[PDB]
């Protein structure tokens, strides 16, 4: 039972690490899409 509780705690820690990785991926995606939208607007303004 202690080994099963340790395995459940390791699975919960892996789920928390996956949630933190998803939050970091969302933050990096927003930080990259900010300059990407800036470059897309700068490219659209020359075509406009």
């Amino acid at each position: 039972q202690r080994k099963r509780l340790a395995e459940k705690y390791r699975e919960c820690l892996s789920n928390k690490e996956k949630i933190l990785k998803e939050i970091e991926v969302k933050k990096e995606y927003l930080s990259s899409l900010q300059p990407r939208l800036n470059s897309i607007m700068q490219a659209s303004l020359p075509v406009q």
């Binding site: 900010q34 939208l37 800036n38 607007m41 659209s44 303004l45 406009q48």
Partner: peptide, 28 residues
């Protein structure tokens, strides 16, 4: 007059898009 209204609507849409891009550049 219809073609001029469509061109003015396209120009106002382009100006609104430029203003939104300027607001996004000012916020970021």
């Amino acid at each position: 007059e219809s073609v001029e209204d469509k061109l003015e609507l396209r120009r106002k849409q382009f100006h609104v898009l430029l203003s939104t891009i300027h607001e996004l550049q000012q916020t970021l």
